Structure 1
Amino acid sequence: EITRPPGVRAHVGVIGGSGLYDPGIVENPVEVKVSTPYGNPSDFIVVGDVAGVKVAFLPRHGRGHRIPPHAINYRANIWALKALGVKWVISVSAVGSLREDYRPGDFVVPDQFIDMTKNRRHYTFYDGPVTVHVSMADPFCEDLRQRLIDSGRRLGYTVHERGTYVCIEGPRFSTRAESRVWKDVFKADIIGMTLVPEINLACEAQLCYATLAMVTDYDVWADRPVTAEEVERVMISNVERARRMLYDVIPKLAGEPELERCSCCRALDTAAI
């Protein structure tokens, strides 16, 4: 609704995770305040240009990693991006691996998730009187997933083309007994803390959302269990590769997502009663 400065619009949104607090990639940056009914987003949104495409960057944890996963205002974040007019949302996330072949340093473009959060307080925008139940059988935007995979291939990086993300509550990491459940019982591939309810809200807002995950650790399975310092060090070490992928992909998003390859682009048509 109201923005300061007024009149600002963007086409692509990038939500940065661990290690990605500044855009790096946007020219002509302007910090924008966007009103939301849910109060403050995680930080200012930075709007600028990448090869003629207008991009909105939001660090989900705020500058300086000030906001842990459970305390993020997910509703304000997604509302703010929608308000600016974005159609595509690239999330960049750090994840743990539950399988030997998904190695630290590899990218993953997941296609499924399992929600094991509990304390995120709001899992939807729709609390009534219009009841909305979106279909999320195929929760990510396939058009954007395929573009991410392609860019990774072209640049010569390893990109695993599928994966189930188990989203846990945190902020503590998993016990060994929990991790055995995620790996051996649920048959999940990667693990993180921030995907839900971000993805739910993106789908309800009819955005084309996909995750570019970077494997930072093997959870509890290496001779040393994951620590926060390790995750951060690995992301910061590799952020340049993530930036090179964004620069490659974003110019190709000048147009609109293909409806037939965007499960949520018309989600509300059959979801609202």
Structure 2
Amino acid sequence: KVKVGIIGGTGFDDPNLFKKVGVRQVTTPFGKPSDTLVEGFVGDVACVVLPRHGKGHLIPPSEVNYRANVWALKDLGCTHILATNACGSLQEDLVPGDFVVLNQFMDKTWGRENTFYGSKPDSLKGVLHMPMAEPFCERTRQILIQAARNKSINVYDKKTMDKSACIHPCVHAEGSAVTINGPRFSTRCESFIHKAMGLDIVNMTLVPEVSLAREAGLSYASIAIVTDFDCWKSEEEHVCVDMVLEQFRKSVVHVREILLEAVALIGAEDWTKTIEANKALVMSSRQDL
């Protein structure tokens, strides 16, 4: 059957999503995960929760062992990963309190281990060139959107709905993220350049987590929590740590509701062909073979 890993960002250190069955420590060919993993059940759906930044939020986005976290969830038999990401908005219609079910990204990270395969010692032998045109699992994306509908959260889809139909607080049914390396926030100059490229939000944690998930043969979807307008607007709306966590409290209640419904909706369907296609995509991407 299925088993859903949850990767919690800011505000989701120990989200108490179910009734904790146990705590498990996993070892990985790529090092230790950010923390031990909490195993349990949402309904009768197996679920495991892993905080991205560890215990007391001591691991910055740039130094998170994304390889170990994803592989640990794969090792425990996860078929899916749902992840949360706090983010700043680059557009007027994405406002604090909204959420975004991302479908695209632009990568500006560096110095992070972004692949399981290579020639280095602590890498799997081989060369893996994975396609990433649409880098998320689309079925799992639509689960997150449907979970929002089931919880009476407004859903805004810019592909068919105009900006006059956008009703806050809402889940944006698509969106593109630029992932910066951190730990600093962007300059106004960088923020305007990203905006001019058409990007919707900026975060620090999406990449390479999303890429490694696909490399691992797992279905991955992310829901971003809009906490601020980055720094392209007026000075009082400029992002800081205080502003990011201030918006978060009312949002985490709704995000947790979305995540819990999504896990149940995943367990209500058959994923046999999707899981097989995920694994076959990894094999067809090996260019050493």
TM superposition score normalised by structure 2: 0.86
Tell me if 1:42 matches 2:56.
no
> What residue number does 1:161 align with?
173
Q: 1:148-173 CA deviation, whole Å, 9 max, x = no partner?
A: 11111222221111101100011000
Tell me if 1:134 matches 2:146.
no
Question: How far apart are the structure 1 equivalents of 2:171 and 2:40?
Answer: 27
> What residue number does 1:81 align with?
73
Deviation at 1:191, TM superposition (A): 0.7
Query: Do the aligned residues in 2 keep the contact of 1:142 with 1:261 (CA within 8 Å)?
Result: no
> What residue number does 2:226 align with?
215
Question: How far apart are the structure 2 equivalents of 1:73 and 1:147?
Answer: 27
Question: How far apart are the structure 1 equivalents of 2:277 and 2:188?
Answer: 35
The structure 2 residue matched to 1:173, chosen from 179, 182, 185, is: 185
Tell me if 1:204 matches 2:215.
yes
Tell me if 1:236 matches 2:232.
no
Tell me if 1:112 matches 2:125.
no
SS at match of 2:15: coil
SS at match of 1:104: coil
Deviation at 1:202, TM superposition (A): 0.5
Tell me if 1:271 matches 2:282.
no
Query: Do the aligned residues in 1 keep the contact of 2:2 with 2:271 (CA within 8 Å)?
Result: no
Q: 1:169 to 1:10 in 2, by over 3 A?
A: same
Q: CA RMSD in A?
A: 1.9
Residue identity opposite 1:126 in structure 2: Y
> What residue number does 1:182 align with?
194
> What residue number does 1:52 align with?
44
Q: How many residues align?
A: 263
Query: Do the aligned residues in 2 keep the contact of 1:48 with 1:55 (CA within 8 Å)?
Result: yes
Deviation at 1:249, TM superposition (A): 1.3
Deviation at 1:229, TM superposition (A): 1.8
Query: Do the aligned residues in 2 keep the contact of 1:141 with 1:261 (CA within 8 Å)?
Result: no
SS at match of 1:78: helix
Residue identity opposite 1:14 in structure 2: I
Deviation at 1:29, TM superposition (A): 2.9
Deviation at 1:112, TM superposition (A): 0.4
Q: 1:265 to 1:166 in 2, by over 3 A?
A: farther
Q: Identity of counterpart residues, as a percentage?
A: 43
Tell me if 1:124 matches 2:138.
no
Q: Which moved more, 1:157-166 or 1:245-254?
A: 245-254
Q: 1:263 to 1:221 in 2, by over 3 A?
A: farther
Deviation at 1:257, TM superposition (A): 3.4
The structure 2 residue matched to 1:98, chosen from 90, 103, 116, is: 90
Residue identity opposite 1:150 in structure 2: Q
Long gaps (5+) in structure 2: 120-124, 154-169
